Amino acid sequence: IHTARLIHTSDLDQETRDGARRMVIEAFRDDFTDDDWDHALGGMHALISHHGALIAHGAVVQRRLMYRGPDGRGHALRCGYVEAVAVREDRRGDGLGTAVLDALEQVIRGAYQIGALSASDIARPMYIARGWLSWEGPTSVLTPTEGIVRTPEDDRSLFVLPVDLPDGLELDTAREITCDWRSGDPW
């Protein structure tokens, strides 16, 4: 069985960051943009290498997810957001994806109030099987110039993993949920 190493972005040399980026881009090839890479930087990376070649990657970066309960109170949850999860093609189906998520979920459970991610279609059963909840209500992003704006192309994609919500808060996945602002894909 393989085990992922967990490394902060700042503990990654440029050679190893460039190798990770190139492995991720190839893994997403039919798609992975310059903004997509920026989104994967700043947090903890899960890495698996074999003889100096990276064969699996994932990242969890901190952001705020905003949720307003029925009673009208607002919540700005410390969110561990999962990005750039990828296994080299020739090494897929061997549990390397599971090893990446095991290490990232340890980060989420140890440090954040909620995990969240916008899953590709292929990865959906994988996350469902691990206990991630599909979000059923509308999604949105908090923009700097127009307030909260709907993001309908992301409604089907969003999964959350509530690990340490504030005392008495219970997420209703049919309500709206809002992510903080960034360039490119908000979710």
Ligand X SMILES: CC(C)(COP(=O)(O)OP(=O)(O)OC[C@H]1O[C@@H](n2cnc3c(N)ncnc32)[C@H](O)[C@@H]1OP(=O)(O)O)[C@@H](O)C(=O)NCCC(=O)NCCS
Ligand Y SMILES: NC[C@@H]1O[C@H](O[C@H]2[C@@H](O)[C@H](O[C@@H]3[C@@H](O)[C@H](N)C[C@H](N)[C@H]3O[C@H]3O[C@H](CN)[C@@H](O)[C@H](O)[C@H]3N)O[C@@H]2CO)[C@H](N)[C@@H](O)[C@@H]1O
Q: Is 93 annotated as a binding residue?
A: yes
Closest by alpha carbon to 104, among 56, 172, 53? Answer: 56
Residues 135-174 that bind ligand X (CB under 6 A): none
Q: Of residues 33, 68, 78, 120, which one binds ligand X by CB under 6 A?
A: 120
Q: Is 83 annotated as a binding residue?
A: yes
Residues 113-152, one symbol each (x = binds its own copies by CB under 8 A, - = not), give: -----------------------------x-xx-xx----
Partner whose footprint covers residue 95, from ligand X, its own copies, ligand Y, none (CB < 5 to 8 Å by kind): ligand X
Whose Cβ is closer to ligand X: residue 90's or residue 167's? 90
Residues 6+ apart with CB under 8 A from 11: none
Residues 107-136 that bind ligand Y (CB under 6 A): 117-122
Q: Helix, strand or coil for residue 66?
A: strand
Q: What one-letter code names the amino acid at 56? A: A
Instruction: Spell out a b/e string for 44-70, using b for 16 or more CB atoms within 10 Å of the CB, else e.
Output: bbbbbbeeeebbbbbbbbebbbbbeee
Partner whose footprint covers residue 157, from its own copies, ligand Y, ligand X, none (CB < 5 to 8 Å by kind): ligand Y
Q: What one-letter code names the amino acid at 89? A: E
Residues 6+ apart with CB under 8 A from 166: 75, 113
- String of DSSP letters for 8-57: EGGGS-HHHHHHHHHHHHHHH-----HHHHHHT-SSEEEEEEETTEEEEE
111 near ligand X, judged by CB under 6 A: no
Q: Is 94 annotated as a binding residue?
A: yes
Whose Cβ is closer to ligand Y: residue 83's or residue 105's? 83
Structure tokens at 186: 């908000």
Whose Cβ is closer to ligand X: residue 36's or residue 176's? 36
Annotated binding site: 31, 83-87, 92-97, 118, 153-154
Annotated binding site for CoA: 85-87, 92-97
Interface residues with ligand X (CB under 6 A)? 27-28, 85-87, 92-98, 119-120, 122-123, 125-126, 128-129
